[PDB]
Amino acid sequence: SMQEEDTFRELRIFLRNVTHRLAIDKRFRVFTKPVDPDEVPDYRTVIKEPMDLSSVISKIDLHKYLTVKDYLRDIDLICSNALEYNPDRDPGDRLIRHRACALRDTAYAIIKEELDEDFEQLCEEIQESR
Numbered sequence: 001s002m003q004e005e006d007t008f009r010e011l012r013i014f015l016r017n018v019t020h021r022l023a024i025d026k027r028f029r030v031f032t033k034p035v036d037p038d039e040v041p042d043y044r045t046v047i048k049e050p051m052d053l054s055s056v057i058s059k060i061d062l063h064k065y066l067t068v069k070d071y072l073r074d075i076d077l078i079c080s081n082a083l084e085y086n087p088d089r090d091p092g093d094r095l096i097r098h099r100a101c102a103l104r105d106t107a108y109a110i111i112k113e114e115l116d117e118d119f120e121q122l123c124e125e126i127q128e129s130r
């Protein structure tokens with residue numbers, strides 16, 4: 001229905017606003033763009049599904065996310081890729097892990113405050129009906 005297409009358009013507006021607030025935070029610059037194959041040729045042999053905030057913006061616009069749960073799976077994949085690729089006691093590795101945990105925690109905190117639980121439940125019930 002028209003009501004249902006309006007629901008998904010509101011979800012896209014909400015997700016684009018959250019994503020741009022993450023992407024301007026100086027701590028999260030390393031998560032804003034795909035890893036350059038050149039600079040890190042080893043990255044794609046270890047990390048089987050790369051994800052970054054620019055790709056997330058592209059996916060919103062392609063209608064890839066019909067719920068906030070499916071959006072948060074890609075934020076979780078950004079964070080878990082960084083934890084897996086940078087696991088050592090080095091200060092460089094510990095700094096990126098600290099930033100990756102802060103990106104995940106910041107995303108979940110914005111959504112907990114600003115998302116209405118009945119709005120997400122409606123998206124989940126339209127998705128289940130298709």
Ligand SMILES: O=C1C[C@@H]2c3ccccc3CN3[C@@H]2C[C@@H]2CNC[C@@]123
Pocket residue numbers: 112113114115116117
């Ligand atoms: O989850 C929301 C969405 C909306 C909002 C937006 C930014 C910051 C806080 C809030 C709290 N509020 C309003 C409207 C909704 C009613 N009680 C929870 C609820």
